[PDB]
Scaffold this active site. Structure first.
Site, mmCIF file in Angstrom:
data_model
loop_
_atom_site.group_PDB
_atom_site.id
_atom_site.type_symbol
_atom_site.label_atom_id
_atom_site.label_comp_id
_atom_site.label_asym_id
_atom_site.label_seq_id
_atom_site.Cartn_x
_atom_site.Cartn_y
_atom_site.Cartn_z
ATOM 1 N N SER A 109 4.558 -67.963 -8.043
ATOM 2 C CA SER A 109 5.755 -68.802 -8.102
ATOM 3 C C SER A 109 6.403 -68.951 -6.740
ATOM 4 O O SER A 109 6.600 -67.971 -6.016
ATOM 5 C CB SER A 109 6.803 -68.152 -9.019
ATOM 6 O OG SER A 109 6.442 -68.241 -10.372
ATOM 7 N N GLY A 110 6.791 -70.185 -6.428
ATOM 8 C CA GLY A 110 7.505 -70.467 -5.207
ATOM 9 C C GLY A 110 6.631 -70.659 -3.996
ATOM 10 O O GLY A 110 7.136 -71.114 -2.963
ATOM 11 N N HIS A 127 13.357 -71.445 -9.736
ATOM 12 C CA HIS A 127 13.207 -70.384 -10.721
ATOM 13 C C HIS A 127 12.970 -69.014 -10.096
ATOM 14 O O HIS A 127 12.939 -68.017 -10.826
ATOM 15 C CB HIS A 127 12.139 -70.739 -11.767
ATOM 16 C CG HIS A 127 10.726 -70.467 -11.337
ATOM 17 N ND1 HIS A 127 9.880 -71.458 -10.876
ATOM 18 C CD2 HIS A 127 9.993 -69.326 -11.349
ATOM 19 C CE1 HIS A 127 8.699 -70.933 -10.599
ATOM 20 N NE2 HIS A 127 8.743 -69.639 -10.872
ATOM 21 N N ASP A 162 12.530 -78.109 -9.417
ATOM 22 C CA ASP A 162 12.328 -76.668 -9.199
ATOM 23 C C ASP A 162 12.113 -76.407 -7.710
ATOM 24 O O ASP A 162 10.991 -76.229 -7.233
ATOM 25 C CB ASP A 162 11.138 -76.191 -10.032
ATOM 26 C CG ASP A 162 10.999 -74.674 -10.060
ATOM 27 O OD1 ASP A 162 11.954 -73.974 -9.668
ATOM 28 O OD2 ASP A 162 9.925 -74.181 -10.473
ATOM 29 N N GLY A 199 3.541 -64.566 -10.323
ATOM 30 C CA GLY A 199 3.686 -63.945 -9.018
ATOM 31 C C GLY A 199 3.359 -64.856 -7.851
ATOM 32 O O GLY A 199 3.725 -64.538 -6.711
HETATM 33 C C1 LIG Z 1 4.842 -65.533 -17.008
HETATM 34 O O1 LIG Z 1 3.572 -66.162 -16.874
HETATM 35 C C2 LIG Z 1 3.432 -67.108 -15.890
HETATM 36 C C3 LIG Z 1 2.148 -67.667 -15.771
HETATM 37 C C4 LIG Z 1 1.879 -68.623 -14.826
HETATM 38 C C5 LIG Z 1 2.901 -69.043 -13.966
HETATM 39 C C6 LIG Z 1 2.966 -69.996 -12.891
HETATM 40 C C7 LIG Z 1 1.834 -70.840 -12.387
HETATM 41 C C8 LIG Z 1 0.834 -71.307 -13.435
HETATM 42 N N1 LIG Z 1 -0.122 -72.237 -12.801
HETATM 43 C C9 LIG Z 1 4.251 -69.953 -12.423
HETATM 44 N N2 LIG Z 1 4.990 -69.052 -13.142
HETATM 45 C C10 LIG Z 1 4.186 -68.471 -14.092
HETATM 46 C C11 LIG Z 1 4.466 -67.498 -15.059
#
Ligand SMILES: COc1ccc2c(CCN)c[nH]c2c1
Ligand SMILES: [Ca+2]
Length: 223
Positions: free
Chosen positions: A177-178, A40, A84, A175
Site C-alpha cells: 500500500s502506498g 489509506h 486515495d 504491505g
Molecule cells: C488486507 O489485504 C490487502 C490485500 C491487498 C491489498 C492491496 C493491493 C492489492 N493489489 C492494497 N491493500 C491491500 C490489503
C-alpha cells in the site's frame, strides 16, 4: 509483492518505507522534502525511512526523518477509495544522492499496454503470509479501462487504473500500500486496493497520479 523478484539494493532509490514502530506502508520521494503515499496509509507519528533495502538491518545508506505534516486529499473517500492519495512533508530535507533520489511527476497519463515497475515490502504469498526483509519488484502492464471495469464492475472511477495480469499469480499485496508504480521514469500510480492478491481476473487497482499533478504542485508550493 506476489510473483516478483528481488530488486537489488538501492536500485529503486525513490522508494520509501513508512514506519510507526514497524513497516506499514510504502511511498515515493518526489523532492527533498515531500513524499507521496496512499490516503489509506494515513496515521499519526510517521517516520519516513529512505535509502532502505533490508528494513530490519541498518546497512549504512538509510536516512530516518520524522513527518512534520500530512495532507490527505480533500476528496478522499475511504469507502470507495476514490482519491486515495496523501502528501507527507519531512521535518528536514533529505540528502539526495545515488541511493536516495526523487521520482518525477508525470506530464501525461500512461497508456494501456505500457510496462511499469511496482515495488514494496508487502506479502509475497497469494495464500498465506510471508513478509520479506528486502525490497521486491514486479514488472506489470497497464490494463485497458474496459478490462479494468469488467474485473471490478461498478467500482472503478476515473481516478483509478488496473495493472497486472488477468491470469493471476503476480500482483501487489498487503504491505505494498502506498508504494510506487513507475512507467517511463515517471510516477504514474500508487498501490491502492484490490480483491485479495494475485487472484485470477482480479488485478491490482492503482491511484491515477496524472490526475493529481496540479493539486500536488499547488500544495507543495504553499506548505
Ligand atoms: C488486507 O489485504 C490487502 C490485500 C491487498 C491489498 C492491496 C493491493 C492489492 N493489489 C492494497 N491493500 C491491500 C490489503
Ligand atoms: Ca536497512
Amino acid at each position: 509483492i506476489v510473483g516478483g523478484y528481488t530488486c537489488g539494493a538501492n536500485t529503486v532509490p525513490y522508494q520509501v518505507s513508512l514506519n510507526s514502530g514497524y513497516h506499514f506502508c510504502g511511498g515515493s520521494l518526489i523532492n527533498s522534502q515531500w513524499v507521496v503515499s496512499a490516503a489509506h496509509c494515513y496515521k499519526s507519528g510517521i517516520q519516513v525511512r529512505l535509502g532502505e533495502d533490508n528494513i530490519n538491518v541498518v546497512e549504512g545508506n538509510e536516512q530516518f526523518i520524522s513527518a512534520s505534516k500530512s495532507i490527505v486529499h480533500p476528496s478522499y473517500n475511504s469507502n470507495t477509495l476514490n482519491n486515495d492519495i496523501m502528501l507527507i512533508k519531512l521535518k528536514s530535507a533529505a540528502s539526495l544522492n545515488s541511493r536516495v533520489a526523487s521520482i518525477s511527476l508525470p506530464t501525461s497519463c500512461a497508456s494501456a499496454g505500457t510496462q511499469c515497475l511496482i515495488s514494496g515490502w508487502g506479502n509475497t504469498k497469494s495464500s498465506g503470509t510471508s513478509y520479506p526483509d528486502v525490497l521486491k519488484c514486479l514488472k506489470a502492464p497497464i490494463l485497458s479501462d474496459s478490462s479494468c471495469k469488467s474485473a471490478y464492475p461498478g467500482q472503478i472511477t476515473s481516478n483509478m487504473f488496473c495493472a497486472g495480469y488477468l491470469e493471476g499469480g503476480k500482483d501487489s499485496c498487503q504491505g505494498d500500500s502506498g508504494g510506487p508504480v513507475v512507467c517511463s521514469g515517471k510516477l504514474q500510480g500508487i498501490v491502492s486496493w484490490g480483491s485479495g492478491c494475485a487472484q485470477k481476473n482480479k488485478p491490482g487497482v492503482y491511484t491515477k497520479v496524472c490526475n493529481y499533478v496540479s493539486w500536488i504542485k499547488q500544495t507543495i508550493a504553499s506548505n
